Structure formats: structure tokens, C-alpha cells
């Protein structure tokens, strides 16, 4: 007994540590108001320094920006300018740190999902119109015409396009780690694009042909990418709409990008076995 | 060129006495100095930059010095100074110690002492390079009332003597 | 695992290059199709002994 | 680029409206000031 | 010229101007598929598409032009536009209105309701055809070759 | 209070009538609780004047007569000497020029009848236009 | 390699370089007047 | 981690007065030191850790040091001190010496003369690091019997002053 979870090698087994204490604060806590007030404390002390300390209070604008509360009574000094540099100080933070830090790793980039994908050298096997022939008499993108099939390029929405490459680069950076080629380190794999393998068979294989698997869908929602600091990833649908795209009739009703690189990626890992079909069903939502 | 007589040396803000007002405590009238905001014809507020020797003294003057090392000690916080002085060249203090007297009987030796500590405190004008004679007249016993006029002898922005003793202050822009 | 074997067989003594099938070696089956090859096969070039 | 790099008019009509809200009390500044000064060089350092 | 304020005193040398953040007419997002009609704003102006456009394409200028609320407008008839009830539209330099809900398509004349007007017509003769007629009633138009 | 930030103009959908403000033709404005559009370009500062505004209602379409004084977008429909004209680019204010309307016609219809060589078919109408075959 | 953070002495010293060269005219900054904290702050605020 | 600050150092058992209980003998009741044991819930009883500073000025007082060497000499085995300092590094004896004292006429003297055997011992606590500033009060004369209390100025487990003379002194996790 024990429960397993999957990992980057099958099921292993999973545990807890206890809270040890010490993390230090991390962005989230920094907020303009919370050191435009601290910064008021590098001042010197004195007569000429000790009212407008006291004095010093701090508001809330529209566009944050923590101010100073000019009351009718002020008294321009130094303190504000302080309560001022502090500002900026959380500003400069927020729109210099935290980005190049939430873009250096996999799994939390948010605007620099393509430029991810250029470093994984990521190539699409359904986009080349010298696609093997393994691949499908017609996928999905392809409409048909008198000499063959035509692929085309579809600019999903903004939105889904950035969930989509986040997910890919996740499952991309999950696999470069080595995994055992078995069932299920590759659906640990290919996890974040919402996708698993299932077999076909249930006798013994092993002594027929084809060993067929077909893709079924996890959910149908990519989980999407937070810009901001405190919150929740929001969810986008996985999916498109050939009409309403307005794309050719030949298409499918329903296109999945999620599928079609989870495909790519297992068809590729599994290119040694000699003898294994992928079912493709289309899946409506 | 010939334009040239004119430093492209500029002032920043200077601190100004009663800058903020008077304040009324049935004991008198205090001064309350801050920073001056000039206005303009349409809106477009500034902060004064004039009196620049007297912005210093009042710099000097109000804001506290470190103490010194007690057997008792200080809390972390409420030893005196400024952080910035671990970077300037100079090798001095930022700040004045008159109110870190250690108050005596006789108000006699009390007004000397202060007398002393407020000049130790005004001569860094002078080394700064802003005065050249700086000096105070703090002259009364009273019950505990004390005037304490302060002299700040100041140049001009063009040598116009020759053949002085001492040699032209190293800040005589600001006009002192 | 193609260029896992090729970067392997490079550490042999005095292998100099190792290069992949050219194109003047493909095949075709009745049909009129690409075959895809099924082992792996790959060319080796002494150029520092032969 | 990787970061955003907002356009710099924006940049410096932010970085004089957080001066004049601020220190100026909300008024706007004299050009070629001692406070125009200050906000062009904020901005050279937060364009570093 | 430059005049000591006071404590308290800004509110009067300068106006303060105070802030403003008006979003109403949705920005223009390219999440978003839009109908021939629907208005956005899009860098503080206000546009109007001008055919059906899918999710994820880019702002261009082809797409969109500009709006003012009581201006109106008769487009030349297009085949990737979603028109309304009594829709008016001009094609080859004629009024037509839109009978019903049309989906995009080519023009087709039994779902536009035309205007009239009786009509009439001048012909030269040619090389090859002879013409006579003017089209009028009692007057038909005739060739003879 | 915090006399130094400034809130207020909260937010409408029709604004508010002021006179510091300039309006192009087809501004709408909300004066007195009630929508305006204004029929020519106005120039800032002048006051509200009852012949520049006309009630209006988003729905309701306004083909007005010609005016000297207009800015029209492209494809607006005006009324000029009881003819229909729609403004073939994003011209500015000016007198009529035929060179920058285009005329809206509406249809035609002529009778015609088959000869000893040729075979007419059609009306002229749209989808049964005039043709001829020998 | 490249580019790091910068001496704690060196840091100030190219601040108050570029404070007086690009707001003061090239004046030095004086000691405990209000440019020489404002210095300071700017300081502060980097090396935060 | 953030929860870090209890220095892992423990204390051993301490001598305590009056952990044996008086021992009444119509002069006065003296206090008879020892080991406290504490006891438990349930059983388990243990030696008690607290009042370190008091607790090595006791070891001090009552242990006798070393004896001066004189022209009779002394028997095998009365010459004070313990075997045990030939192997520390501090270059110190172990023990006090007031119960040496050359007892003389005039009172006053030998009460001069406790004060300094005493005031030098108990120096030692300085000299160790427990304490900072041992002193002792010593003033009767009566027929025989004085009055010798003494004060042990300690400090606490965390630096709160800043700006001492001095120095935290070396052993201020005993709490002094």
C-alpha cells in the first residue's frame, strides 16, 4: 500500500516534508505602499526630520501608485520625496524583476512562450507539405484538392495559441529529462497538453500485428498562464470551431492543436517499434 | 564665448526658514523651516533654491549627531547620525550635538558648553567651503531663555579684492 | 537514437567523420512509395589511415 | 526584446505625474528646471 | 514673477487635473470575432468593421473604418459580411435592401428587395448590329443583325 | 480629502455638452437628458446654438441635405438637389463636386421584343438582366 | 561575467556623478544639503 | 531556518544556595549549598541548570586556593588549590583566599584586607566572561561580624544596546 502518483519514472510513490521557515519574501509581497512607507526610515532623525515623519501618510490612486495625502495643511519636505523613490523602487521591481524571472523557467513563462519554443527547435509534423505518409491519408488541417491534400496554416487566438505553447513547453521540458519509454511516462509527458494513450488491446498482445493506441482527451481546457503575482492560471478552451474561424469545408468540425502535438510527440518517441497504428477519433467538446 | 562669465553651476533646493509657517505654543513663536514652493504665472509650482548658506546651517543645526559610546549604550535605532556619511570623502560627521548637552547646575557652564559645541558644529561651513567666518554670539543666562544670533559671512560670485590672507573659499558660487 | 549511435560510433579509434545515408540511396516499394528503414544504418569515413 | 520596454513617451509622462503628485502636490513642473532635471534623470536610470 | 506659495495653497496656483479612465465601446481584442457593424475603440478612436472577422486575426487597416455615432453608411455589397433586416447596400451604384438575415454569401437578387423605377436606354449601331428601340413602353427595343 | 490627487468626470457612454470642446459632424452629445447630433463641424468655444444640434436616437438614420460645412466619412449618404449621393473618399468640408460623390442609382426596366435574327431575353432587372442571342 | 553588481562605493560615486553633471551643471555636491540626500536616496533605492 | 535563534548551548548542572537547607546553630542560620534535584510528572527526577553566575561565584568562595609559601612550609596534602588547574590553558588558579587572611588588631584593617582578597577573587568572574562588573560591599566592623554583599551584573541572551564602551563579554549565553 502506499498510492502512487505519476513521475518522470512511472509511479513512483509521493511524500510531504515538513514547513521548515525560512523562504524569503518573494515578489508577491512587495507592494508600493507597503515600501513607499519603509522607505521614509533612511532619513536622518532631528527636529527638522521628526514631524514630517510622523506626518507622513499614504494613499491609493487609480493606477496604484501609491501617493502622498496632500492634506490642506502639508508641509513640502523631503519625506515625501522619499515615500516617492520608494514608489518607483516597487514599480521598478514589479515591471523589471518579476518579468525575466517568471520567463527564465519552463513552467511559469507567460510572454515568451515562442521564443521557448525556438530554443526547443519544436517543428510541427502536420505543417510541411512533405509529411510522411504514416502520418494520415488527410489530417485534420489538410483540405483536399484534385493533386492531393493542402495544409493550412491556422493563427489561433491569441489567447489559446499562448495556453497552447505554454503546455507544449512544459510537456517539451518534462521529456528532454529522459524518460523511460513505458505507458506511463509518456502520459506524464504528454499531460499538460490534455491528451493520454490507451491502448487498444486487452489479450496478451505480443504475438499479432498492429498495436494500435488511441489519444482520448483529459479535459477540455488548456490551463492557461497568470501575468500577475497573486492569483489563478485562467483556463482556456482547447478547441476551435472550423466555422467559425472561417476556414475550408474540408477541415474537420472540431481542431485540436493539443492533439495534433501530442501525436507528433508519440509517434516520434515510438518510431523504433516496427509495428503501431494512432487511431485519431474526432473528439467534439 | 565672451558670454562665459556666467558658471553654468546650478543650485538645488535649499531649506528656508519659516518655510512652513509659524507655530504658536504660548511660550512664542517658532519657525517651522522647510522647503518654499515658488509659483508661476499658470500652475507650474517649484521649490525655491535661495539662501543656500543658511540651508546648510539649518541642516546642521536640526538634525541630530551620533552620540558617544556609554557603558550603558544606545538602542539600535536611536543612536543618532546618518547612514550616508559611510560614503563621503571627507572624513567627517553629518549633523550638530547641542542638544546632546549633559545638562549641569550653574546655567553658566550650560551656556558655554552649548556656546562650544555650536561652533565645533557651524565650522563645517567653513570646511565645507561655503562661509569663511562663521561665529555666534549666545549671550544670556535668564531663568533658562538663551540668544543665540548667528553671523554667516558670506563673498560674491566675482573676485573683485586682491591680495587677501586666506584663500577664496572653494564654494563662493553659491554666494554665501 | 539515430544520433545517439552516431555520436557513439564517432569514440571508435581513427573514425574520423560518420555520416548519415546520402540521398542517391533511398528506396521505393512497387507502389511507388518511401519506404522508411527500420534499423539503422549509417556510413564511417578513416580519413587519416586509408 | 524580452522584458516589455513600454514606449517612452508613456514612460515619462508616468515617471513626471508620480513627481508632481508627489512632491509638487499635483501641479505640473517648469520646463528646463531642477525638477525636469530630476525626471529626465530617473528616467535614463529606469531605462538602464 | 515667481510668488512664494504658502501651506495650503496649490489647489490655487495650478488647477490640478484630475485623473480619467473611460472604457465604455469594448476595446478592440483579437479574441474576439466580430460582425460587419460591431463598433471597438482602438487607440482612443472608435472603428467599425466592415466585414465578418475570425478570432486571431491582427488589426488591419482593410477591416475597419472609422465611426462616428450618427453618421451612417451604405458600403458596396460584400460576400463576407452578416447583413441585418432592411440592411440598405449598394451594388453596381444601386440601392438594395436586405430582405432578411443574410449569412455571408454572394449576392444573390431574390434576397435583396431592388427599388425600380420604370427606365430607359440609348443604343448605337455597330459594324454588325443594327439597334432601334428605346425600351420605353410602346417603343421595345429591337437588333437586327 | 488628499487635496493633491484630483478624481472626478466619472464615466458616461454619450458625454456631456461643454463649450471648450470642439465636435466634428456626427458627434453625439447628451444635453438636458436628451441626445443631440451635430449637424457641422463645430469649431471649439462656440456656445450651444439650437440650429447645430438635432435630436437624435442610435436607430434612427439621418440622410441630411448637403452641407458647406461637413466632414463626411466615406461612404455617407447626403440629399442634394433631391438626389442621393454617398462621399466616395474621407473628404474634408467644402462645396459639392460631382468628382467626389458618387450618384446612388436604383434600377431600370425596358421592354424588348425578339427580331426576325435575334432572340431577346430579360428586363434589365437584377438576376434578369438584358441579353441577347443570335 | 559581463555586467554585476556594482561596488558599493563605485555605485554611489557614479550616481552623484550623473546628478551633478545632468541636473546641478557639474556643482559638487556639497555635504548635508538636500542634493546630498537626495543622492543618498537614489543610492538606497539601487542598491535595494 | 527564520526560526533559528536558541543557541544550542545548554547548561550543566549549577551550585545553589540554600539547596541543602540551613543549618541552624544559635549564632544564625548559614545556607548550606548543593545540588537542587527536581522532580517530575512521574518520577525521572533531575538536576536543576538555573542562577549559573551565583552558582560559579559560590565554586570561587568556597573552594581554598593555593597557600603563599612560607619558611615552615606546609604538610603534604593542606597546601590548597585543585590538581586539576595544572591542565588548563588560561594561566589561573582555582579557588579564593579569604579564609587566609593574616588576621591582625584593629578590625578595620582585616576588613580592608577581605575586601581586597575578595574583590580579587571575584575579579575572576569578569575574567572569564560571565559577568561585567562584580563588586562587593563589604562595611562593618562591630566585634567581629561584616556585612559582604555582592552584586554580579549580568546581561541578557540578545544584544539590544548598540554603542558600548565595552564588549558583549564572552559567555552571555549563561544569561549572567
Known sequence: MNVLIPGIDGMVSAGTLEYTGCCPPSFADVDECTLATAFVGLLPSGPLWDRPKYEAITTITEAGNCAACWTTDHCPTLVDYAVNVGARLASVIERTIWPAVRESDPFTAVTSTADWLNRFDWVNCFETSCRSKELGEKTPIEYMTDCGPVYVKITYPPSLQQAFESALIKSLERLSMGIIKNLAAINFVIEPLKVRVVPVDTTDACENETLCVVLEKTSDFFDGVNANTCGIPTPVAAYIDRDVMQLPSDLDKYIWPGHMAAECIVRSLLSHVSRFCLIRTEQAP | CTVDVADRRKRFWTTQIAACGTSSDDCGDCARPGLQLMCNGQGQVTVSTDNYAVGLALNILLTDASKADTGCGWTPGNRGGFWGDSFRSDNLRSGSKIRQVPTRTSMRETVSLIRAYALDDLKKLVTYGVAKSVDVDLTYRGSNKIDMTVIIQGVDGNESRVGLTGERISNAWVWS | TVEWLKSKAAEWPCVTDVFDLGPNCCAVNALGEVVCPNNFEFYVLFRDTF | ?48 | KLRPLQVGGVPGCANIPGGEDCQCWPEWTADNGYFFGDVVQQGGVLYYATRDVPPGTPFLAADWAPYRPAATAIPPHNENSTYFQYQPVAYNDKLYTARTDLPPGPFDPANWQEISVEGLVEVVDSATIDFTGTGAAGDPVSADV
Open chain 4, 1 to 48: 526584446c524580452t522584458i516589455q520596454r513600454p514606449d517612452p513617451q508613456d514612460l515619462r509622462n508616468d515617471i513626471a505625474t508620480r513627481f508632481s503628485t508627489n512632491v509638487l502636490g499635483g501641479a505640473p513642473i517648469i520646463p528646463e528646471s531642477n525638477e525636469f532635471y530630476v525626471v529626465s534623470l530617473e528616467y535614463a536610470m529606469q531605462e538602464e
